[PDB]
Each structure stands twice: as structure tokens, then as C-alpha cells.
Amino acid sequence: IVGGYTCGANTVPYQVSLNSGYHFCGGSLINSQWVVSAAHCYKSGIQVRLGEDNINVVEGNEQFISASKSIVHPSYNSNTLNNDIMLIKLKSAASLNSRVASISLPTSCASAGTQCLISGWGNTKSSGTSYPDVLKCLKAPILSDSSCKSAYPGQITSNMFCAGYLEGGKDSCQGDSGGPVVCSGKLQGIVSWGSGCAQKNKPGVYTKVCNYVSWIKQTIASN
Ligand SMILES: [Ca+2]
Structure with missing residues (x-):
């Protein structure tokens, strides 16, 4: 920004960091087990990091949960970026509270x-x-x-x-x-x-x- x-x-509280050894994209928590992000952020091996502020320091409100599956929009076009949306499912449900929320x-x-x-x-x-x-x-x-x-x-x-x-x-x-x-x-x-x-x-x-x-x-x- x-x-x-x-x-x-x-x-x-809905902001997540997508991590593959490092932060590479944002996302939005839309229920306890699903995140919305951009299709152009797709890769394998995603860990979803919830409850983050400083992404380089463990501060006490984090939940780190690996993705079980990703679903890029069926009509995503990477050349035009039309339909730049994907869903990411968490292997386990996040614990929702004031600081981690959909x-x-x-x-x-x-x-x-x-x-x-x-x-x-x-x-x-x-x-x-x-x-x-x-x-x-x-x-x-x-x-x-x-x-x-x-x-x-x-x-x-x-x-x-x-x-x-x-x-x-x-x-x-x-x-x-x-x-x-x-x-x-x-x-x-x-x-x-x-x-x-x-x-x-x-x-x-x-x-x-x-x-x-x-x-x-x-x-x-x-x-
Ligand atoms: Ca942190």
C-alpha cells in the first residue's frame, strides 16, 4: 500500500497473509474454513496466516493453517486478468474471535x-x-x-x-x-x-x- x-x-480481522515460506499475497477470510484471494496468486503449498500484524514476528494472535485445496475461477484468464478470483480451503477451521473474523x-x-x-x-x-x-x-x-x-x-x-x-x-x-x-x-x-x-x-x-x-x-x- x-x-x-x-x-x-x-x-x-479478516485480512490474511498467504505464505509459501514468505508472504506473497493477501486474502480475505469469508468463513471459518475458506479464504477469497486473486487467481493470479495461485500456487501449491499455501499456508494461510490469520491474526497477523507484523508478518516477521510472532506476536500472539496468529493462526497458521495449511490449505487443503485451491479453486481458481473457471473462467480466469491470466493474460487479461478477467475473473481474477480464487478460493482457498483451510485444512482445519480457524478459531473465530474479535481479532480473527470473517x-x-x-x-x-x-x-x-x-x-x-x-x-x-x-x-x-x-x-x-x-x-x-x-x-x-x-x-x-x-x-x-x-x-x-x-x-x-x-x-x-x-x-x-x-x-x-x-x-x-x-x-x-x-x-x-x-x-x-x-x-x-x-x-x-x-x-x-x-x-x-x-x-x-x-x-x-x-x-x-x-x-x-x-x-x-x-x-x-x-x-
Ligand atoms: Ca506475526
Whole structure:
């Protein structure tokens, strides 16, 4: 996250870190045994780390649970990043409490102008690289689909939305992928892509979670 703020320990209780020896992507806990992330974060050997603040220090609220299965969206296209969503099942259910909690799926799609919370452990610089260790947060509005398409001609599908600031300076970034965009207490987006980070006229692009609620529910019900 570039241009954000330190969230505070366990203030984003649905945020998870996906670990394969190291943090590589975010995700969102949506029930005691399932995480939503980006399909472009897929790999084998995932350990889901819940209750994290500093990802390099054991601070006392962590739960580390290996994944038993991953399910990339059936129509994910890695070239266009259309349908950039995947589900990860935990081998055992997480213990839910104030500091480790699921986030609700949306009942309806958000609108442009709504403020959301974006979070992650990704790069905090637009130029160069610095990874923060504690969780970072950014409040940002969803942008109009016309603004989004104008920023990224020929690239924005109905399964994507832009959020952030056209002026630059505030955005998600490398290492935030797969993490949450939460608006009015519901998971509306997944950190997906963008051209660089926090550049002028290049806002963040996010997977539009409300389009996937039926798929998510059905998939969980049979897996
Ligand atoms: Ca920790």
C-alpha cells in the first residue's frame, strides 16, 4: 500500500497473509474454513496466516493453517486478468474471535463514490521498493466505470472496477494482490492489478466480488 497508514494490530480481522515460506499475497477470510484471494496468486503449498500484524514476528494472535485445496475461477484468464478470483480451503477451521473474523459477502454491488478500505503488506513505494512488515491500510473511493475505462483503454471488463485517486500517491501495490477491498462492511473487491503503483491516471483495478457471490456460495457448498 502506497500513501496509506498503519492499520493497527488486528484491526482488519479478516485480512490474511498467504505464505509459501514468505508472504506473497493477501486474502480475505469469508468463513471459518475458506479464504477469497486473486487467481493470479495461485500456487501449491499455501499456508494461510490469520491474526497477523507484523508478518516477521510472532506476536500472539496468529493462526497458521495449511490449505487443503485451491479453486481458481473457471473462467480466469491470466493474460487479461478477467475473473481474477480464487478460493482457498483451510485444512482445519480457524478459531473465530474479535481479532480473527470473517468478512461478509456483498448483498449488492457497490457504486462509484463509495468509500472502501484496502489493506495489505505490499510495497509502500511508487518508485523503488520497501516492504512494511505491519499491515497497511488505505481509504479510497470506487471510481466511475467511465473514468476506469478512460484510464485503461481496452482493458476493463464487467468483472473489474477501479478505486483510488487519479492524482496519484495513494494505491495498492505489489504484494497486496489478493487482499480485500471492504465497503460498508462487505467484501466488494480483491486487489488485482494496475500500471505501477500510485501513478497519476493509473488507479488500482480490483476484481468485482459481487459478480461472484453465486459461484462462491455454490463452490463452498460442495467442497
Ligand atoms: Ca506475526
